[PDB]
């Protein structure tokens, strides 16, 4: 399918969005409502994800998390706002989106001319630090700059799943916005947290990996 929504563990699902360059996002099906992790590429791709969500649960989509300011994590925002979902991010992500959205849209369209020239749609729930959703079962945190200055991780403690965002993935990928020297420092700060992790979901390439994906990418970026 153009997009798939698949259970990883209990309420924790992975989204494979095959539009444009494949990106993987996540969904958490909570008792009172649904949390989307990563807005997907466009308002149309967001609508496609919502269609899949409405075959699994009738509960409202409460919020979407922009895990960075880039088009693959924030492009769907207009759609999510249009159906009453809050758009959630860190202060830094919101700040960078405000200043740099035009630039990232232009960059995206250089490789993907078919990609729409999307207007800015900012997060409207903006956090000064780390934050949780779903009564602490969805835990967003910043461990430093990497693929972008602002990219965050999302951890699901009950299921021991870490969403890797654009930070963790199989291939070196795009380094145009990256802090290449900070990248391994951020991955080491992450590993120093000693989170129980059974599964890491890569934000690009094949989603399902073990905790070793962290060390895999760390080795790649040190050689870049
Ligand atoms: C389409 C490009 C290829 S460098 C891409 O993968 N982008 C552009 C912004 C979001 C995403 C990324 O770098 O993770
Ligand atoms: Zn990405």
UniProtKB/Swiss-Prot annotation:
InterPro entries: Beta-lactamase_class-B_CS (IPR001018), Metallo-B-lactamas (IPR001279), NDM-1-like (IPR050855), RibonucZ/Hydroxyglut_hydro (IPR036866). It is found in: Periplasm. Substrate binds at residues 108, 147, 169, 174. GO terms for cellular component: periplasmic space. It is an enzyme of class 3 (hydrolase). GO terms for molecular function: beta-lactamase activity; zinc ion binding. Transmembrane segments: none annotated. Its cofactor is Zn(2+). PROSITE patterns: BETA_LACTAMASE_B_1 (PS00743), BETA_LACTAMASE_B_2 (PS00744). SMART domains: Lactamase_B. Its main location: periplasm. Confers resistance to the different beta-lactams antibiotics (penicillin, cephalosporin and carbapenem) via the hydrolysis of the beta-lactam ring. It is able to hydrolyze penicillin and imipenem, but is much less active against cephalothin, cefotaxime, meropenem and ceftazidime. This is Metallo-beta-lactamase type 2.
């Amino acid at each position: 399918a153009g997009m798939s929504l698949t259970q990883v563990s209990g309420p924790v699902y992975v989204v494979e969005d095959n539009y444009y360059v494949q990106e993987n996002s996540m969904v958490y099906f909570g008792a009172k409502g649904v949390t989307v992790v990563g807005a997907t590429w466009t308002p149309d791709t967001a609508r496609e994800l919502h269609k899949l969500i409405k075959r699994v649960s009738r509960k409202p989509v409460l919020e979407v998390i922009n895990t960075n300011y880039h088009t693959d994590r924030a492009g769907g925002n207009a759609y999510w706002k249009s159906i009453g979902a809050k758009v959630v991010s860190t202060r830094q992500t919101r700040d960078l989106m405000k200043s740099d959205w035009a630039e990232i849209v232009a960059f995206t369209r250089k490789g993907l001319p078919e990609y729409p020239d999307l207007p800015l749609v900012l997060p409207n729930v903006v956090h000064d630090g780390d934050f949780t959703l779903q009564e602490g079962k969805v835990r967003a945190f910043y461990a430093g700059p990497a693929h972008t200055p602002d990219g965050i991780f999302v951890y699901f403690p009950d299921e021991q799943v870490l969403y890797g965002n654009c930070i963790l993935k199989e291939k070196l990928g795009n380094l145009s916005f990256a802090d290449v020297k900070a990248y391994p420092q951020t991955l080491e700060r992450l590993k120093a947290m000693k989170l129980p992790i059974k599964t890491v979901i890569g934000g690009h390439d094949s989603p399902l990996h073990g905790p070793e994906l962290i060390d895999h990418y760390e080795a790649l970026i040190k050689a870049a």
